[PDB]
C-alpha cells in the first residue's frame, strides 16, 4: 500500500532530523541547528545534491563516523521513493 510508505518516510525523516539536529546541530548550525533546518538538509541529501562534497565531508572533518548516519539514510530514502513512486503509478493500472 502507498499510504504506508509516505507515512513511513515521514516518520523516518523526523527521527533522522531530530538525530541530526542532536548529533551535528551544535557543530554545524546552518545545516543542522533546527529540526526544520535539518529536514531541509536531509531532503537535499535525499536528492543526492552536493551531499558528499557539500555536507558530509565537511561534517566528517569533525565527526569522522558521520558516514554511518548519512549513507544508510540515503540508501533508505532512495529505495523507499522508487517503491513509492512506482507504487502510485502501478496502483491505478
Q: How many angstroms separate the most distant Cα atoms in the chain?
A: 49
Contact string (CB under 8 A) for a copy of itself, positions 43-82, x = contact: xx--xxxxxxxx------------x---x--x----x--x
Considering CB distances under 5 to 8 angstroms, the limit depending on partner class, which of ligand 2CV, Na ion, a copy of itself, none binds residue 13?
ligand 2CV
C-alpha–C-alpha distance, residues 55 and 78, integer Å: 17
| 15 touching ligand 2CV, by CB under 6 A | no
Contact string (CB under 6 A) for ligand 2CV, positions 25-64, x = contact: -----------xx-xx--x----------------x---x
CA dihedral over 48, 53, 55, 57, signed as positive or negative: positive
Q: 66 is written with which cell numbers?
A: 558521520
Burial of 20 (0-12, 13-18, 19+ CB in 10 A): buried
C-alpha–C-alpha distance, residues 69 and 55, integer Å: 12
| 84 touching ligand 2CV, by CB under 6 A | no
Contact set with ligand 2CV (CB under 6 A)? 13, 36-37, 39-40, 43, 60, 64-65, 67, 71
Amino acid at each position: 500500500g502507498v499510504g504506508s510508505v509516505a507515512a513511513l518516510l515521514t516518520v523516518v525523516f523526523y527521527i533522522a532530523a531530530v538525530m541530526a539536529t542532536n548529533l551535528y546541530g551544535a557543530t554545524f548550525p546552518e545545516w543542522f541547528g533546527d529540526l526544520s533546518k535539518s529536514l531541509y538538509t536531509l531532503f537535499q541529501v535525499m536528492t543526492l545534491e552536493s551531499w558528499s562534497m557539500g555536507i558530509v565531508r565537511p561534517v566528517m572533518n569533525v565527526h569522522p563516523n558521520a558516514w554511518v548516519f548519512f549513507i544508510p539514510f540515503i540508501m533508505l530514502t532512495t529505495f523507499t521513493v522508487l517503491n513509492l513512486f512506482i507504487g502510485i503509478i502501478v496502483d491505478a493500472m
